[PDB]
Symmetry: D2
Amino acid sequence: LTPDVRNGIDFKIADLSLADFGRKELRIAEHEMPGLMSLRREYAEVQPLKGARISGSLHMTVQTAVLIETLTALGAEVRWASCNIFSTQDHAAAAVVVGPHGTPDEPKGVPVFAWKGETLEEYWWAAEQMLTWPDPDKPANMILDDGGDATMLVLRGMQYEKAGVVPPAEEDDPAEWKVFLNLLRTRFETDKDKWTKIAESVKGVTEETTTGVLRLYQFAAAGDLAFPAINVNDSVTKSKFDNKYGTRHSLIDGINRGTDALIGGKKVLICGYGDVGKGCAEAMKGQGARVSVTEIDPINALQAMMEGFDVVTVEEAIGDADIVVTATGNKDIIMLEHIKAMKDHAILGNIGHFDNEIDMAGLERSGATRVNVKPQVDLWTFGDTGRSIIVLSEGRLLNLGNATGHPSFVMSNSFANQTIAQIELWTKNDEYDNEVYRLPKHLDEKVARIHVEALGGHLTKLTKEQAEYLGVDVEGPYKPDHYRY
Amino acid sequence: LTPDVRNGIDFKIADLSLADFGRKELRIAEHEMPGLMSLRREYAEVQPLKGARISGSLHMTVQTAVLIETLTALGAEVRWASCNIFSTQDHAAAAVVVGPHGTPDEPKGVPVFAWKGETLEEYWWAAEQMLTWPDPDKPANMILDDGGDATMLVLRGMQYEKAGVVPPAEEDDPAEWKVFLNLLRTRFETDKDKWTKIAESVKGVTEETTTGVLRLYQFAAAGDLAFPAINVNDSVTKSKFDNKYGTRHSLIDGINRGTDALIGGKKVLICGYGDVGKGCAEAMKGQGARVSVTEIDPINALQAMMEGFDVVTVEEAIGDADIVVTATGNKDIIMLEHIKAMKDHAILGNIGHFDNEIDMAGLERSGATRVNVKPQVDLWTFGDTGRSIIVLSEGRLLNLGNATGHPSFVMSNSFANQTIAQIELWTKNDEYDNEVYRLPKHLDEKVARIHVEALGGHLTKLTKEQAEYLGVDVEGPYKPDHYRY
Amino acid sequence: SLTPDVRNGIDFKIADLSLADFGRKELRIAEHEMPGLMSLRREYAEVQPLKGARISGSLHMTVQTAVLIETLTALGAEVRWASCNIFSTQDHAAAAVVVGPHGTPDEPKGVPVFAWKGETLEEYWWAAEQMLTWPDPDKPANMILDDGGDATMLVLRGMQYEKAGVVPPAEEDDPAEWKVFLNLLRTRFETDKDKWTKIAESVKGVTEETTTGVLRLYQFAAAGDLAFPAINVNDSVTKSKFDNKYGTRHSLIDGINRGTDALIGGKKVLICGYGDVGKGCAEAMKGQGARVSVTEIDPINALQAMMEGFDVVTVEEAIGDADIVVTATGNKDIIMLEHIKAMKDHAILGNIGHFDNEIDMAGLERSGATRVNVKPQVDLWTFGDTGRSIIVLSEGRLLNLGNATGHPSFVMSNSFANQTIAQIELWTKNDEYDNEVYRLPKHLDEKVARIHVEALGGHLTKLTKEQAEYLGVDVEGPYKPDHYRY
Amino acid sequence: LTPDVRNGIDFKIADLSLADFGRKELRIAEHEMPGLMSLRREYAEVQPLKGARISGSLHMTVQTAVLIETLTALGAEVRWASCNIFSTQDHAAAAVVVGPHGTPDEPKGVPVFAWKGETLEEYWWAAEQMLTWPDPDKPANMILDDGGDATMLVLRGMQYEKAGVVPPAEEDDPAEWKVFLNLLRTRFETDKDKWTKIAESVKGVTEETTTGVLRLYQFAAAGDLAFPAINVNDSVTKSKFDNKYGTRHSLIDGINRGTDALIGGKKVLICGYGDVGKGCAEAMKGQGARVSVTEIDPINALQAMMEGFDVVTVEEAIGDADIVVTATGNKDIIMLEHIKAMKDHAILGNIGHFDNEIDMAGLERSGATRVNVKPQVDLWTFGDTGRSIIVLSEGRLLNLGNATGHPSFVMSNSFANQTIAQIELWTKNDEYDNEVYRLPKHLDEKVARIHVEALGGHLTKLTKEQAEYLGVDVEGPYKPDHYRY
Ligand SMILES: NC(=O)c1ccc[n+]([C@@H]2O[C@H](COP(=O)([O-])OP(=O)(O)OC[C@H]3O[C@@H](n4cnc5c(N)ncnc54)[C@H](O)[C@@H]3O)[C@@H](O)[C@H]2O)c1
Ligand SMILES: NC(=O)c1ccc[n+]([C@@H]2O[C@H](COP(=O)([O-])OP(=O)(O)OC[C@H]3O[C@@H](n4cnc5c(N)ncnc54)[C@H](O)[C@@H]3O)[C@@H](O)[C@H]2O)c1
């Protein structure tokens, strides 16, 4: 694996001739992304990001394209990789590399290292390409991360440099841990302070997802978070909309492309009843399913029951579930003993961030046979029972891998939050300690207001007398810091 | 255009080498179509359809492939074509020509003339193939229709022969009407009684949708119904299930693939509140759209309202609609006036059985400029306003054009009913006069019973005093003839 | 001895006539919510289509019924009225009907009414005979307006025993209402001999409002026993697809909220039956956050319950887990004593069918379980052997009208428009009807539906000349074939 | 007005003979209130509240009665008054004064000063009764508040005492403001530090509603909150269940009792989209209504739109609404002006905490005539238009004025949180300063867990390795502090 170069842009993607079809959907997506457009207009002259060099780990989709060309429209230089092996949309990747005014032959866009259907080896390769800038004296000075793989690579790789050695891996280290480490080990043979120099260059990380943000909270508590981080996941306009309303749209997209299995009349098991779970269950309900949920949190559980859902354990429900979805951000939800209890031709998929919510490592060692139906749809048969399980996306996130992820309108919230967070960490950089921060409420409202307008919502303006009575400014913020919406 | 023959089988399709992919999904499909699988088992011995030569005009999909292969398992010969130029699933076309035990080099299935993306001319050519059996002495003897296109062809065809002329088409007749006429006319040159003979030979037609059944009721009212017809659309297990629940599923699949636009938050306009309209609104609603309905029938109108929908006219509503779907079975729902009024990048599609629900002819002659984004998605632009519209499937049923149609489990009801009507008309032709029939309630109940059973429902059994209180047999039909479900 | 009251020439038996002014206020509000009936008063005001009609009505004595009663009188008809349930009467509504739009309690101008909330079985049948029995033996009732067939049954059985020349004895183990019904007939026979025979001869037609009563008319007609014409009012599309469904969706949870104040959200709800009423039931409970399961004997209804997100289960497997149990079948013997004894502590048990035989009320009353009345129509039963108590609504009689008010005015507007349309048809075109069971014609259902679309603010599209041609329909309707199921 | 006494207990209630009906519904409520019931068992022997003298201002309902008897079962002494003029359940007041073991003759319960249909004069007299403990050396040491009127009475009272003047009222002050001061000024003529000594005696207040809480925030802000407060409202188990799921149940109850107008098919207008408004909107949706929402907060607005609801202004939507419901906790939502614009027989009510969301004061001055239909249902007519409006509960909260408020199972959450806040503020009292606190997550989850098992919900237990993965204890808390559920 070696990068390609064309008119001064280095990259690796499926197919550069997909740019026209890429660019077509870019423009449509832009009508569906008023958050990002409004920010381009608000920030064109200002150039808030001049001097920013952004390293991005984020699903290389159409919506991430519009995100990228917003970031560059505010002065940033970017380099990009997907944060999932299947989530790349090749046509969006190509329009990124070509740019709005370039061609396949003479691309005038940004470096992108991503294509749909990476191996774990090429993924980690593309991840290192995105963090590695041409001139050794101006490395990445900023990170846009989703999952924390960009962040994790930087900080473990500094830890290994500062310790002196990149460690061995045993056996029951995941196949990815090997690959991950393999990358850093070889890197060390030739380069003794690569990551350390990146880590002091980087002003901040902004992190998109619940999981990445969890990893962030564990670096801060170790003492190992080297630069500030905005938790973008926990914008109100991120979680309460993307995680939930995004998934309500995209779960069922993922399952329809995978399987064309009817949803109505079916027993559907959702594991997890957070924002993602709530989105899944709502979607399944709307479609006529008989939805049951799992949960470890008594509160989240009380909500599911108040929404008409049984609250049940995997063990109790698994043998009779027609569709099983894991949505927990946790590992070990569907183990092999579960998969063997499942019914013939039941569907099994994961919509959390990682491929370990489902025992894929166990299923591959089990003596089941895999028959590939088509991209990202696999049919697994146990010979002892005769029963087959349809597995979506090798247990990686079915929505981004079997479909196209959330809709443009949803990501317009998420990526508008992401843009803002980068501006703030870049322009107001000494205003931050080495901690996880969340955006101010005024800015959450800013973003919400763009989409209410875009949708045709008519807001009531508080009178002077009304805002004295509520103790708030007419123009926001409207709620206490602990308001949960 | 001429047939391909390979191993004694004529056919014309996209690509024969897709038979294994088709086969895999067909086999998956059999696990989701207990209705068809169960009639295969019941009637394997009997071979109820021996001597049948069935010409089938029905969307060449995986679910049809399973119907087709149900009929051949019961001893019928078939010749097949799609009832729509975009509806064919080519991997399934391949699967049926190859057969369950053939390969592409040695195919062992049946004649299929169908591919996704036919032209009108090719559509009519394909259809003639399907109705024209190899042996002049052994013409088609059954028609299995969906939309009445095969029925119309035999009957206008015969009509023109008894007339000794095929009418010249008027200079402003629709493109398809000219094609249709030109096909018949070209044939009257070399074969003067082809269609009359076929019509003498055909013992029955089974009709699967509302539009087509209308046309039967029109041939009958004219005295021009030359054979018995079973109205399969209006089996309870068909209309109340396929038309409603099918659409609830396949509509948003159609939209997610064609456009990937967020439904939640959007103003959705659904023209028509028949079963298909009911299904669309249910679908949109569950997904968070703000749904308004149009209707001409105050009964269906009041139902919408009672379901939480504004009942509005296209004129008052079109300006505001983010997504516009026609679901009427009628022509001229959305004229060029209406399209020129839609907001920028609004979406327009038709899920009714033909493409005159939208004014595609007016849109094609308008002067607007077309840009194909990808198959079955076109962005139309008007110079005088600068507004562009996303048109799905060129006004053709969008669930099948832009997606896969209804799921297997749904189609199992419809096709079990079609299978049953085929058997009835074939084995008992004498019991039927030249009229349009519906199947007895007890058969509808049979099909229902199989699917409840498949999903895990537990039916209650009437005691003897109960059954006598209700005036019904414990097993027997359970509801009066006028019962509306 | 129960005897009627007479004030100002108007005989009646009701709770309290001082309730008229209240009743009247609510009736007036109710007219705003019943455009169906209101438009019918307007359209038929000078044609007086019901002059000479003497209508005996057996239908819940509610605010909505009162508006129907006065629609019929606005149109020339005379009436005598009883409720078709011992708990369904709204006493202030009863009051206002006897008083009239312009009467007072001391100077009543209304019509005869025999109904109060909390009747006994014997009072119910007495009230029923009072309603059926017009003042002049030479001017008997000539029309029946029925809900559940009790009037029609009283007459048709009443005549069939006369002829038989005697009224049977009842068995040790006959239902208590049967012994009562029989004792009424047998007692009148000792004095009168052709009372019901002459009445059944006088009646020009019956209009039946509900599913249960229509089964009974099908069962009279099949036996050669239907002796005047019938219109099945239930199977108007505007009736069944609207009242039975959307109506029950309103009034089911009303009944439960009044009866119990139990949170519906998070609870397991067993709905027996998935006809239009079961569908209304499950809809209503689903939207309140309930965990809904359904029982059914019919695979079509059952396949719909499943496609709507509901398990289809037997009472046997379901009963131990359900927090609220609602019967909605039209059938007998749905929740037996073994079933009730299996219910969890303080689960709620309700019937929303037309008769109380859906729940084993006789069985439970002879079980040995102790009864404590909580309040009007909420009773708490205790089994000594398990220590479990169950909350029984309306002593097993329809719970929406027993524990609440029934369906809203807007919903009844549709049903009552249809019945009013039927009465007029059967009265003025009596000639063309045979002694069969009839349904209204589509254009009339459409008429009803249109008033209500109009009232609600909805805009109907009008077919062009080409669309109507293309569909083979007149522009002005009817819009659908005869078998169309909506 | 002077209180009654009987067997040592002073009270002013409607009718003591209602105690039997009172007590039967109490025992049924207890089966619907596992939170309260688990706290009676947990804390029976520990007697945590001994020495607590709790002044209760909260809706005198069946549910509040099971709360009270939990408090007394835990050692507290209490005096009670309702916090709304119509919300008292006369028979719950009775069973409370009688106790489980007394008779109407010899009551063995607690002091209550509450009945349905108090005048403003009577409401305030009763609040003072409730706060004025019989021994001067043992005044109130605890307040349990809903709406902040008890808190207001105590801290304004004291403030006027420290200033030597209860300030003369202005000729057209809100009628309620005049009654407030008349009560103070009159006590002040004879008692110059009644409230000062009461404020110095109260160790803390536990506040139950969003609106009470607001006021608490405006005491702290001014430096005037002279004891610790607990925000009970903002336990997850309170706001996300009571405000939301409570209202979903009770809104429609109050409407059905008051009016028995069909909800399906009607245009409903919900002002405000917080927890209450989401509750209302949810409820009206399920019943079939064509619901529109008003809002000032774009985040809340974007939720309503994602949820199938137009966001609109009163002005735009008022002439067309069938049912208008304000859920804002703000003032001046519906003015006389909007009221005059309402359609004939439109229904109008308020479900926020005070009456002034609707311009009641201006309605009464308008020249509209009031006809009382029955308790809490009034018909108002404008002679100049001839149109009438049904106003519910004189614009006081309609669920508790026209019905019975939230059901037992919902209030089991609120009142378990309340009982816990009372234990904590009382037993661990020194650990608290004169600020507004919120209970710790682990306590919320504790309350949630009781109700989930009561409902038959089966929680999943995290493995050691699962807990370690998430960095949480197997027994919780499971979420960070900013988690919004
Ligand atoms: N695409 C699919 O997967 C699928 C499935 C089933 C049926 N269909 C096709 O769907 C169409 C509708 O079928 P259906 O079973 O719902 O029919 P339907 O007869 O049940 O309802 C169509 C409704 O549209 C209303 N309508 C007619 N003209 C109108 C106008 N100008 N404006 C607004 N409303 C109008 C009618 O009153 C009618 O109720 C038919 O062509 C049918 O063949 C498609
Ligand atoms: N309370 C009301 O306001 C109200 C309103 C309308 C009708 N009703 C009454 O409700 C009843 C139902 O009316 P409907 O129109 O829904 O009837 P329906 O005939 O449309 O449905 C009743 C259902 O009960 C099912 N059933 C029969 N026996 C069964 C059993 N043992 N277990 C489970 N299901 C069984 C049948 O399959 C049927 O579909 C009738 O008695 C009618 O008079 C009451």
